[PDB]
Design an enzyme around this catalytic site. Structure first.
Site, mmCIF file in Angstrom:
data_model
loop_
_atom_site.group_PDB
_atom_site.id
_atom_site.type_symbol
_atom_site.label_atom_id
_atom_site.label_comp_id
_atom_site.label_asym_id
_atom_site.label_seq_id
_atom_site.Cartn_x
_atom_site.Cartn_y
_atom_site.Cartn_z
ATOM 1 N N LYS A 102 -22.173 51.637 -3.535
ATOM 2 C CA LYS A 102 -21.406 50.891 -2.503
ATOM 3 C C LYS A 102 -22.017 51.180 -1.127
ATOM 4 O O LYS A 102 -22.236 52.368 -0.828
ATOM 5 C CB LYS A 102 -19.935 51.315 -2.570
ATOM 6 C CG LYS A 102 -18.966 50.501 -1.724
ATOM 7 C CD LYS A 102 -17.527 50.937 -1.880
ATOM 8 C CE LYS A 102 -16.570 50.131 -1.029
ATOM 9 N NZ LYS A 102 -15.163 50.542 -1.249
ATOM 10 N N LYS A 129 -24.714 52.199 -11.362
ATOM 11 C CA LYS A 129 -24.783 50.785 -11.815
ATOM 12 C C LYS A 129 -24.940 49.837 -10.626
ATOM 13 O O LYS A 129 -24.469 50.185 -9.526
ATOM 14 C CB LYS A 129 -23.521 50.412 -12.595
ATOM 15 C CG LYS A 129 -22.236 50.355 -11.784
ATOM 16 C CD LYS A 129 -21.053 49.884 -12.594
ATOM 17 C CE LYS A 129 -21.244 48.503 -13.182
ATOM 18 N NZ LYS A 129 -21.370 47.470 -12.127
ATOM 19 N N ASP A 139 -23.974 46.457 -8.484
ATOM 20 C CA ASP A 139 -22.687 45.724 -8.351
ATOM 21 C C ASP A 139 -22.745 44.480 -9.243
ATOM 22 O O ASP A 139 -23.861 43.986 -9.492
ATOM 23 C CB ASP A 139 -22.355 45.428 -6.887
ATOM 24 C CG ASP A 139 -20.894 45.681 -6.571
ATOM 25 O OD1 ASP A 139 -20.621 46.598 -5.772
ATOM 26 O OD2 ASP A 139 -20.041 44.966 -7.133
ATOM 27 N N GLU A 140 -21.591 43.993 -9.699
ATOM 28 C CA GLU A 140 -21.566 42.873 -10.634
ATOM 29 C C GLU A 140 -22.236 41.632 -10.059
ATOM 30 O O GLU A 140 -22.822 40.846 -10.808
ATOM 31 C CB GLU A 140 -20.126 42.556 -11.037
ATOM 32 C CG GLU A 140 -19.175 42.390 -9.869
ATOM 33 C CD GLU A 140 -18.223 43.560 -9.722
ATOM 34 O OE1 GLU A 140 -18.564 44.672 -10.180
ATOM 35 O OE2 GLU A 140 -17.133 43.367 -9.145
ATOM 36 N N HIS A 153 -20.614 44.039 -18.706
ATOM 37 C CA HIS A 153 -19.549 43.871 -17.733
ATOM 38 C C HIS A 153 -18.810 42.571 -18.017
ATOM 39 O O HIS A 153 -19.431 41.543 -18.297
ATOM 40 C CB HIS A 153 -20.101 43.868 -16.310
ATOM 41 C CG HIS A 153 -19.054 43.661 -15.264
ATOM 42 N ND1 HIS A 153 -19.004 42.531 -14.479
ATOM 43 C CD2 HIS A 153 -18.009 44.431 -14.885
ATOM 44 C CE1 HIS A 153 -17.973 42.615 -13.659
ATOM 45 N NE2 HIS A 153 -17.354 43.759 -13.884
ATOM 46 N N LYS A 198 -3.389 54.323 -11.804
ATOM 47 C CA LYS A 198 -3.490 54.948 -13.150
ATOM 48 C C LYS A 198 -4.066 53.895 -14.104
ATOM 49 O O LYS A 198 -4.201 52.734 -13.673
ATOM 50 C CB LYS A 198 -2.123 55.447 -13.627
ATOM 51 C CG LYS A 198 -1.843 56.919 -13.355
ATOM 52 C CD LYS A 198 -2.918 57.831 -13.906
ATOM 53 C CE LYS A 198 -2.587 59.300 -13.750
ATOM 54 N NZ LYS A 198 -1.350 59.664 -14.481
#
Lengths: 133, 420, 133, 420
Positions: free
Chosen positions: D135, D161, D163-164, D254, D294
């Site tokens: 990021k 990884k 980013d998509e 993904h 969560k």
């Protein structure tokens, strides 16, 4: 017991037996001579004694069946003469492994190859009792 | 009978077959030989009865050289034994030997390297080679297979091999196994300083897949692969042997499904013919015998086919099963591989029977050594080297094998735990 | 603070925790045994402990997923026996890292692998407080 | 109704679908199931009403095995859900589950390596894997992207990884990113001594471009690549999975655009069917959940599709959403990847829920650690290892997670700055 992977190098034929004495080397050379073959002596220092892939960096396509240090350096009538040459090679190169080679004179192929000397100075090898820990 | 010519003298280029045939009662042997024989016609030139057998005869057939395709074991087997075992006039039929004329032999490439080139490439002289079959047979992951390979090779073994039925399965895909075995081979090489190898199984469903596996082995730089020639086929084997010659790979040959053709004495093809077909098609090693308890089978027969697959010139010897003089005109020899339960105290017998130009295989997976795989491999290597040294000194191995083993065990802790 | 890039080597599982004591190793081995798995011991000296690309020189096409020194050398009923073997391996090879491995006997796959010993002689690794400077 | 056969017993080779359908008022459920069903005819063999819902029924459809193309997820989805969500007679329709018979499963390659082969290749055992999403999402140069990758990996993370939406843009072309990421991966490997990796995005406009990016990754020797299967397509995914199996590359998947199909309870395809389609088509990892606050979503449903995508044999369990027993006949399992805001004190919960066979992803990019990216990665790794060690000792993570985190923080300066 556990086979030690530390400083346990070997040199093919008869390398797993205890170091051969002068009489044993003589008997092996007599066996080579009896068959009609020619005995000679190979020697190499510790830097060029074990197989390596140093020159594989220059090759493409494949490196199958290529290994470095397969060739040693060349140093022949009976056991006594080869033993005298073994002592001469020991004196000239004390830090070098000595290997007795056999050559069939008719087929012109190598037929024998056993180590007969391990430099005391070099400690890359173990002893018959220190091979397991 | 136009096809039985007892006065015919076989030409120097004829392919000769020696058939052991039992004709049905009422059928004379000359008629049965004529049928098997039937310018391009095969002819029965010699029939000898088998002294000590019931209505059994040896029929010698001569085939012209123009009948066969150059360098094709497939065609040779199609012509000689294509449809002759289905003759109703024969109660039983068994091909015993073949004579391959030099003219035909020269059309074959033969084994990719041979025994002498193998020894030179591996830099191992004056002793037999040692191998192990990774056990358990199946279920092991590629990682664990590689771990077993590394443990067995670091002990002093020259080779390890995949199980005959290990090609590519959900439990262990072939490329994972190739990679892990390559890592294990290189680790063992670095540790011991000797050149190591593993018989990677290239046997596959399609020739394309088999060549892809051979290509992966070539790209890893590993020394040797394996093939099942009697199940994969001569056409697939010949392709693999040509590839191995082109790319400098050794080729180990396993004779899966051989007993289905060479077990019964009255019917089938004798293993010696299959061994000669393998040598023609190509193979550096050929699993040639089992040592259950001891080397099984008549010793003379074993020696005969070992000499047939090793030497360059084998003279006719009916005592050892050689029905014809075989000139190999400098075709590379094939190294026989004796596998099975090679126990430590049985090493002197096999060293005496085979000599230096053979590979002894511990197809039982060893594991009998209480210490581990590596010390068990060392014990085997120590025993083999001690037996070889004793034989070179003029000792009679068949009489002093136990003494030599004990003397080696006196100084070898690894062999001490193995000799018990 | 700054993560030190000098002499800060790690060995996968549990390597980022402080060195495990005998009781902690014993509890981990008991956990492995409880699941039905077999514990064993791996060891390697400093020269063959870390991953390397030494043999990639012999390969073509690709080297994806190939790394050297992934295999260590092999050295199994309960925690106490494995602890005794850990001490035995320590005595036999004092300059070698020891790793406890687990093997599922049914799936025949490796299921566990954590370092339990770091040779005091070798200084290629840091301590829990010296990891940041 | 020729297509509603309540007495039909599904065959061992039938493909079974469980549709949750709400028919329009006046349409009986049997008629609606007959319509969805409509030798090669699909048939409705079972209809059960949903107790506690308004006019909602579960329709079980059996399709003959001959209807589908071998090893084609594209065809399977075309046949099952091609044009059935557009029926006017159904107010809402939702595919809940599929039963893939072993006969069909065997026609698929499946994931290139699977979980166990991944663990063996990466030499990581007994713990979950850790990953971070570099990021900022976009705008970063290939050099700065590589710098961030190296900083995060050297801390102790196993993966990073792309980013998509990072494929190839004017700001960062794909080959520059691949080269800089390869340098960063190798630097972090040399520094830490552990095998590292980065999910390189191969998702591209044309299959040729995607294969070229995979080829570049293979030529760099890097371990793993990434693909967007729901946007790239099953045809592109299957090609990439076959390539990855051929060339020994790991494949992270993904699920971009998944909520467009699996979010609404009344309409669409449940994620479990998409997860089974991914496992058939091929993928070593599959982003399977988000941890906002969560782990989101019913735990039982998550556990159900995690077991469906991991285990070899999943028995029918309607409590967890398993409508059919699924036999995978030794197809490699897919590793679930839980991403999102994985805070340090939330690690025990996810370790308890997922176990060791999962990858926890810090898709927030971490950066919450005041010291830097590398110490933040170390804190995460320390927390994960401490939780795993506590779980192995017999501790109840759901009750002692805070105690374990505090105890780990007592000796970890990096975790001390993270736990605050």
């Amino acid at each position: 017991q556990v086979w030690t992977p530390l400083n346990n190098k070997f040199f093919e034929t008869f390398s797993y037996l205890p170091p051969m004495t002068d009489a044993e080397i003589s008997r092996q050379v007599d066996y080579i001579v009896s068959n009609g073959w020619t005995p000679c002596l190979e020697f190499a220092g510790a830097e060029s004694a074990y197989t390596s892939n140093e020159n594989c960096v220059r090759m493409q396509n494949t490196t199958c069946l290529y290994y470095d240090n397969r060739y040693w350096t060349m140093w022949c009538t009976d056991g006594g003469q080869v033993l005298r040459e073994v002592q001469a090679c020991r004196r000239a190169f004390p830090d070098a492994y000595i290997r007795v080679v056999g050559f069939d004179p008719v087929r012109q192929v190598q037929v024998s190859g056993f180590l007969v000397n391990r430099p005391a100075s070099v400690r890359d090898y173990q002893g018959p009792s220190t091979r397991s820990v | 009978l136009t096809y039985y010519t007892p006065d015919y003298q076989p030409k120097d280029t004829d392919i000769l077959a020696a058939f052991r045939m039992t004709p049905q009662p009422g059928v004379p042997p000359e008629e049965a030989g004529a049928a098997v024989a039937a310018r391009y016609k095969g002819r029965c030139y010699d029939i000898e009865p088998v002294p000590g057998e019931e209505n059994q005869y040896i029929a010698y057939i001569a085939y012209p050289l123009d009948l066969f395709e150059e360098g094709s074991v497939t065609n040779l087997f199609t012509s000689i034994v294509g449809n002759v075992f289905g003759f109703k006039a024969l109660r039983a039929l068994r091909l015993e030997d073949l004579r391959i004329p030099p003219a035909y032999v020269k059309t074959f490439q033969g084994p990719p390297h041979g025994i002498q080139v193998e020894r030179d490439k591996l830099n191992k002289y004056g002793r037999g080679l040692l191998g192990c079959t990774i056990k358990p047979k199946l279920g092991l992951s590629a990682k664990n297979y590689g771990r077993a390979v590394y443990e067995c090779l670091r002990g002093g073994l020259d080779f390890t091999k995949d199980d005959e039925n290990v090609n590519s399965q959900p439990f262990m895909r072939w490329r994972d196994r190739f990679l892990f075995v390559a890592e294990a081979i290189y680790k063992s090489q670095a540790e011991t300083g000797e050149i190591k190898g593993h018989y990677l199984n290239a046997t596959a469903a399609t020739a394309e897949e088999m060549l892809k596996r051979a290509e992966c082995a070539k790209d890893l730089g590993v020394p040797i692969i394996m093939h099942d020639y009697l199940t994969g086929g001569f056409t697939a084997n010949t392709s693999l042997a040509h590839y191995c010659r082109d790319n400098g790979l050794l080729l180990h040959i396993h004779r899966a499904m051989h007993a289905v053709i060479d077990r019964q004495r009255n019917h089938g093809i004798h293993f010696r013919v299959l061994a000669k077909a393998l040598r023609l098609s190509g193979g550096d090693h050929l699993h040639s015998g089992t040592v259950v308890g001891k080397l099984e089978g008549e010793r003379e027969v074993t020696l005969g086919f070992v000499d047939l697959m090793r030497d360059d010139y084998i003279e006719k010897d009916r005592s050892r099963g050689i029905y014809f003089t075989q000139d190999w005109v400098s075709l590379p020899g094939t190294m026989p591989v004796a596998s099975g339960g090679i126990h430590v105290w049985h090493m002197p017998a096999l060293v005496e029977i085979f000599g230096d130009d053979a590979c002894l295989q511990f197809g039982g997976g060893t594991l009998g050594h209480p210490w581990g795989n590596a010390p068990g491999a060392a014990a085997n290597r120590v025993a083999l080297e001690a037996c070889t040294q004793a034989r070179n000194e003029g000792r009679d191995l068949a009489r002093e094998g136990g003494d030599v083993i004990r003397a080696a065990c006196k100084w070898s802790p690894e062999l001490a735990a193995a000799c018990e």
